[PDB]
Amino acid sequence: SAAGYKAGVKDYKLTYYTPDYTPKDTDLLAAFRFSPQPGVPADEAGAAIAAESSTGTWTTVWTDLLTDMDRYKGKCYHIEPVQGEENSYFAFIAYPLDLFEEGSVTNILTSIVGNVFGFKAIRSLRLEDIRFPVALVKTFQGPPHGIQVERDLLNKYGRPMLGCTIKPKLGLSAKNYGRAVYECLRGGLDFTKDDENINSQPFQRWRDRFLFVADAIHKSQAETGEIKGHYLNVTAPTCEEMMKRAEFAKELGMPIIMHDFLTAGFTANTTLAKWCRDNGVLLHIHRAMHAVIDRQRNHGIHFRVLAKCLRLSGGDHLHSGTVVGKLEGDKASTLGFVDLMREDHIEADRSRGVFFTQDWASMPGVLPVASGGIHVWHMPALVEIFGDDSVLQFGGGTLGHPWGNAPGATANRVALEACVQARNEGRDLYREGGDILREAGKWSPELAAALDLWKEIKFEFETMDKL
Amino acid sequence: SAAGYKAGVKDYKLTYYTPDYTPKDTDLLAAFRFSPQPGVPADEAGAAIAAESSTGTWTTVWTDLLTDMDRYKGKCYHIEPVQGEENSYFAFIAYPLDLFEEGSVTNILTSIVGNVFGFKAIRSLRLEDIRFPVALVKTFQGPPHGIQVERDLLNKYGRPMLGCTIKPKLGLSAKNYGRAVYECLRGGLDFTKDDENINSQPFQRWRDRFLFVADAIHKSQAETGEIKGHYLNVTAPTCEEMMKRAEFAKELGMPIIMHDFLTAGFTANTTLAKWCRDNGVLLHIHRAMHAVIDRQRNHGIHFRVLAKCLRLSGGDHLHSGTVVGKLEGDKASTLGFVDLMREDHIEADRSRGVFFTQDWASMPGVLPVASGGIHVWHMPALVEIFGDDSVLQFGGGTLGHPWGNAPGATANRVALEACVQARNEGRDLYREGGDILREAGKWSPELAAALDLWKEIKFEFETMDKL
Amino acid sequence: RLSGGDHLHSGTVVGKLEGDKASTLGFVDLMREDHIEADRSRGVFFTQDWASMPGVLPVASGGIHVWHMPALVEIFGDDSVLQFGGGTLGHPWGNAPGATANRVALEACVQARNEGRDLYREGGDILREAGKWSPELAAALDLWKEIKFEFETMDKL
Amino acid sequence: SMKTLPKERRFETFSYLPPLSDRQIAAQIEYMIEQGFHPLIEFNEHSNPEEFYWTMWKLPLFDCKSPQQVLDEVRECRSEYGDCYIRVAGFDNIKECQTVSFIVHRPGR
Amino acid sequence: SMKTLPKERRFETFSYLPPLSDRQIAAQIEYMIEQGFHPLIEFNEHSNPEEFYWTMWKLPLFDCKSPQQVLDEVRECRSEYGDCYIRVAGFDNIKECQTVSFIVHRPGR
Ligand SMILES: O=C(COP(=O)(O)O)[C@@H](O)[C@H](O)COP(=O)(O)O
Numbered sequence A, B: 001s002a003a004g005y006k007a008g009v010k011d012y013k014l015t016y017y018t019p020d021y022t023p024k025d026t027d028l029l030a031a032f033r034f035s036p037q038p039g040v041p042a043d044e045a046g047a048a049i050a051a052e053s054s055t056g057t058w059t060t061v062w063t064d065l066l067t068d069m070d071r072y073k074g075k076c077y078h079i080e081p082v083q084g085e086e087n088s089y090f091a092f093i094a095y096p097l098d099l100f101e102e103g104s105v106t107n108i109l110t111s112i113v114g115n116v117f118g119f120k121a122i123r124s125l126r127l128e129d130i131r132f133p134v135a136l137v138k139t140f141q142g143p144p145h146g147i148q149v150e151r152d153l154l155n156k157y158g159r160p161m162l163g164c165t166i167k168p169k170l171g172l173s174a175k176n177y178g179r180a181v182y183e184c185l186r187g188g189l190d191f192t193k194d195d196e197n198i199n200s201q202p203f204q205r206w207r208d209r210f211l212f213v214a215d216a217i218h219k220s221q222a223e224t225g226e227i228k229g230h231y232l233n234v235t236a237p238t239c240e241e242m243m244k245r246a247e248f249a250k251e252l253g254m255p256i257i258m259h260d261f262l263t264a265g266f267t268a269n270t271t272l273a274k275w276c277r278d279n280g281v282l283l284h285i286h287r288a289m290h291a292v293i294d295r296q297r298n299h300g301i302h303f304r305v306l307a308k309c310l311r312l313s314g315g316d317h318l319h320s321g322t323v324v325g326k327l328e329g330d331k332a333s334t335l336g337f338v339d340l341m342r343e344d345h346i347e348a349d350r351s352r353g354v355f356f357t358q359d360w361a362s363m364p365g366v367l368p369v370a371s372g373g374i375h376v377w378h379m380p381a382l383v384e385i386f387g388d389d390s391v392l393q394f395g396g397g398t399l400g401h402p403w404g405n406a407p408g409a410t411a412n413r414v415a416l417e418a419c420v421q422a423r424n425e426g427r428d429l430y431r432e433g434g435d436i437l438r439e440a441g442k443w444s445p446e447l448a449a450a451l452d453l454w455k456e457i458k459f460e461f462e463t464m465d466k467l
Numbered sequence C: 001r002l003s004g005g006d007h008l009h010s011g012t013v014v015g016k017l018e019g020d021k022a023s024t025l026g027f028v029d030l031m032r033e034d035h036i037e038a039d040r041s042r043g044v045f046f047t048q049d050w051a052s053m054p055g056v057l058p059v060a061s062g063g064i065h066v067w068h069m070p071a072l073v074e075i076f077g078d079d080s081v082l083q084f085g086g087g088t089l090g091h092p093w094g095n096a097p098g099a100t101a102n103r104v105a106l107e108a109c110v111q112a113r114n115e116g117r118d119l120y121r122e123g124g125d126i127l128r129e130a131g132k133w134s135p136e137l138a139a140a141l142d143l144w145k146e147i148k149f150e151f152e153t154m155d156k157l
Numbered sequence D, E: 001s002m003k004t005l006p007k008e009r010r011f012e013t014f015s016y017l018p019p020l021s022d023r024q025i026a027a028q029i030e031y032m033i034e035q036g037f038h039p040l041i042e043f044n045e046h047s048n049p050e051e052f053y054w055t056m057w058k059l060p061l062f063d064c065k066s067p068q069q070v071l072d073e074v075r076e077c078r079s080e081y082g083d084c085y086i087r088v089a090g091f092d093n094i095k096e097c098q099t100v101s102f103i104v105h106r107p108g109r
């Protein structure tokens, strides 16, 4: 029983550090990487994190004794120092299933990462991983459709899908936008897409874009004999305005729309993912602003947490990085969270950054989207890294082709299919990639022109987000 | 005119670095603190940021020439190295008014901070400030009510308002929750509040909390003769569920509700702020997860940007930190963004972290809320720092009083009014604060008991977020 | 009257904004009565019937004060709303005394009228009499004694 | 040694302090003058937290550089309305908010 | 030399004037007769502005060319209902609106 109110400040480690705790299968587990302020012991730091992220505050309150605190409190049940890093530790914290609102990523984030990152007693803190228990995973809808259903809906099998972001990012009228869309799609790309900051602006209001883009899809589809799509961005100032936009996309019979889940938010995104499920529209998720949060390895939230949170909130695609392109992506941890966003069961593997074994209880996978600074020369690597179940996106790598969009699209589609055929035949994309590309360039002049153009372009910098 | 398509990669600094640019009054200005990768020049780094956050991609696209790129492109118009920091610079970038959707914080964030933070060519990046032009500020609703209207609605004048977060964070039933609320409010606090991770959970479903809390407000108000309120948390998994909760609060005649704007998102928050304006409900904004983003000074977004974004999206209160409490808050920059969230015109002042002069075109101010690890001994400092137009919140500093909630509330309310009287009389809260408190403790036994309890409790650590 | 309203501003005649008395009496009849004979001296070109459509209360507003009260009552009669903006909030003692001054001035004029006094001839006397027992009325009479609006009307019939 | 808190009606700012001496009242009115606020005396038969409006005593003291002038009006108001609550308020006309507010007289008994 | 306006309940038309002498009451009833309005005496236990209906004293005085006849009914009504407000009203049956209305008796104390 709960006996005896004693007012005043105690140590957090008295209640919240529980190194004897063995997590239940219904517990939500979090792994934090932290550095304590000088003179703040690791275990008191870990317990402060567990306390302020569950049930505790800074002094003793009598109200604790009205309830059963043992069954509600977070339990920092393990601390280990980071190998080779001075004054850096992992704390592993267990949270009871009861602490969380069912089906709410918003609430899970508010608890785990709400306040503890700004603790004075803590120099830096980074959430590395969360083990979502199956009992909680089952309170979420997840992807509106997911990988299998999407491929069935679109009649797309046996290869990565190919997309293209229209450029310039901003500035084009609705008509020129659809023009660029038609030429890209007629050339052999499966998808085109709004850039993430195309919403509704003076130079191009959204309903106009939706209308002209719908026309470009019908034309290019009638010409090529393949299903075409364009991720129309419905990201908006308010829920109402977001729904309005999503609704007109449905009205036009558009198979796929687009949402920025971090800048719009998880509450709006979860609304949209539900809508999409009920209305049979596919949901491409852009990850804008993620690097504000996930880049540096000392402070923030690793993307693989954000990726798990989105699989729960709901999306059919999610940008996963390129590894080889203009934006940062560590190959080891990228293979880690691609597995986390695709598979049903992922064993813990710290070499991939996977701290906890994750089960998804048959919740559909999310197609990874490689986008950003990639071109034809990257194609064998992209196929080897991501495999068939991916979307590879070439913005500048299509619209920056010497002959324009349709030749640019053919170059990429030929480069892709060549790599897939070579792979199926048993060629090593790693060793023979450039040769497979040069061979294909022998009979594809538009591919040859692209290979010529981008031969020298590599992105090779030191990755900040080291495991 | 736009003449001549030349395919291939150029330097960003060729198009996007414009050191001769003088920003128009309608430009949105951003200040970034960045470190380039070795061998990436500062000006090319600044131009890469301006490019990928406005109109540009990684190769040349012909579609540029369909539009007028000079009038749409971001312009890195100034770079200066950080004094004393090696390989650290400020880039100042101007963005045309046309780039942004009217009244959308979601879209502004997606553009400015969407992708540029993960650029391989960039080691670290942090957004310090944004100058929102008046023409854009006027497309937003802003606070549903704001400081003046709120004080008029509540009949609260001449002092800081006093609140209290109910503890434990999680675990209490709806009835015990309202019990703790009644005892706090009857003791002299203006507000109580849900903790940020109280949403709807197995141990306490939201409608039950709203119902029992409404009863506690009526009782404590009838007893004391002062308007009472409780920030009911309507933060939810989806927009629909958020509106539902907000709606029942209105039905009960609750004067104030609560929202986590970052974990729920700006799209949901903007929906809620509009609703609140139309339904005359006050909106307390919790800032959960902000420190994941704003703590470290090398990478992320400074809180003063998030605070400006929220004043635009809409909230009547916003947690501003304590400076002196358990969570980090630098005094200089805190005074900076408190001015930014309260005043109509704030001159640029780099000693306060204010990079740009900001005008608000008569958009209402947001009450700053000091909350986290504070108690009676902090009262003179809190009053001196924040002044009358603030809400001071004591969670553990009320419920951890030796005699319970109502004595705990009286202790704080007496401590507050004593400090305000002393201040009005011309006493120096800095010099004479403890004396003013000891004097008041002579005639207030419950204040004396609190002074006794928390005499030794200070939070004094090195602040990571140095200017 | 057709589109729909219960009040309509009709001008003051005597106040700060233009209103020709003859044509004002004309359209006040048009907005109030059921049948209005043609009368070109009032600017009424056609006989108008309203087939029992309700009248609209005329509202006299703009630059009027207590001294105008007998004229306003004589011109408009009972079925009117008389509005004093500056003539209430510009009272020396504020709003409530300002309101009492006007309400007393009004009721005095109405009583005098019902008793058979000529508001035209005796208006200032009725007001001075009432000011004997109403200090707030007296203060208003004092304040606005000299204030008249007398210009050439552009809208001549 | 905990006491149970007594139930006692309160009246907003300063009403948890021991009642203001006339010197303490004047110190608060001095603060107004210095801050540039305009004093206003209001009275009400009741003290209901829900009601927005009390009744104005005369007009706000706009041209006031003298605490005693305010104190004289309070004395005069208390003479006419000793059956009422009387409250001194300061008004900031730049921010257009009431900045100060405290009861200076509760009704007889 | 401003006074604060006293709070005092009122009763619509003429209630801001000093109370009508019986000669002034008769002057108003004469006006009715001349205007062709029909006098009606109504009484009510209360004077609530919200309520539409008072109670009719007998019937309206339709055939009336005599102020004293009205005054006699008021006297008689005041005898039976001195605990009540009594009001004289004139009714225009052509426009079908009550044209005159003033209280002639407030209840005892
Ligand atoms: O501008 C872009 C791609 O253009 P391009 O194809 O011209 O390089 C962005 O959409 C990035 O892909 C986003 O980053 P992540 O995909 O890393 O989230």
Ligand SMILES: O=C(COP(=O)(O)O)[C@@H](O)[C@H](O)COP(=O)(O)O
Pocket: A057, A058, A115, A118, B165, B167, B195, B196, B287, B288, B319, B320, B321, B322, B326, B327, B369, B370, B371, B372, B373, B374, B393, B394, B395, B396, B397
């Ligand atoms: O638990 C809390 C306060 O409790 P207590 O009053 O018991 O310390 C949080 O709401 C912090 O105030 C949040 O941080 P910021 O206010 O810094 O956003």
Ligand SMILES: O=C(COP(=O)(O)O)[C@@H](O)[C@H](O)COP(=O)(O)O
Pocket: C009, C010, C011, C012, C016, C017, C059, C060, C061, C062, C063, C064, C083, C084, C085, C086, C087
């Ligand atoms: O400002 C006004 C009156 O103010 P005040 O009472 O201070 O003079 C207007 O409403 C005029 O009445 C309008 O003109 P008409 O009524 O002629 O349309």
